[PDB]
Every structure is written in structure tokens, then in C-alpha cells.
Amino acid sequence: SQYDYIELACLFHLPVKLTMKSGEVYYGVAADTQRNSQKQECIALRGEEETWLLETDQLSSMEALSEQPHFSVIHFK
């Protein structure tokens, strides 16, 4: 069917590179999905120095930073 690769990255705490529709890039460990204070759906990404709540509606791509069988680069919407 249809795999939720965001959910799967969080389930396995995968290291990922996230690119936003703005073009900004973030690197870190996929921690969890949650809503931010604005009630927008987010992925919690634990980066080197801080954790970001990044809106899933604003994701352009998610890239694996490790070898695993699930994905290399996922391009969204």
C-alpha cells in the first residue's frame, strides 16, 4: 500500500537530511512526529546542537544518512 516514510524514519530513529520547501537543509536523527504549538504536524529532528519541530507540509525531501533498506532520497508532493 502506502508507506509513511516519515513515521518509519522516526520508528527506527534514522539519521536523515531534511530539505524544506524554502531550500533550507537540516541534518539529524528522526525522533518523533508531533504537533507544534500551532497544532501543525511536525517531525522532531534532533540535530547536532538542538532539536527542531519541522512542519511535514513544508518538507521537500528526506534523505537517508545511513545504509538501510527503506529509502535513499524521498521527494514529497
Binding site for its own copies (CB under 8 A): 1-4, 7-8, 10-13, 15, 27-29, 46, 48-51, 65-66, 68-70
CB of 25 to Mg ion, least distance (A): 16
Q: Which three cell numbers stand for residue 49?
A: 546542537
Q: Which three cell numbers stand for residue 48?
A: 547536532
Which CB contacts under 8 angstroms, 24+ apart, belong to 36-44?
43/6, 43/9, 43/10, 43/18, 44/10
Identify what 39 binds: Mg ion, its own copies, none; CB under 5 to 8 Å per kind.
Answer: none
CB of 13 to Mg ion, least distance (A): 6
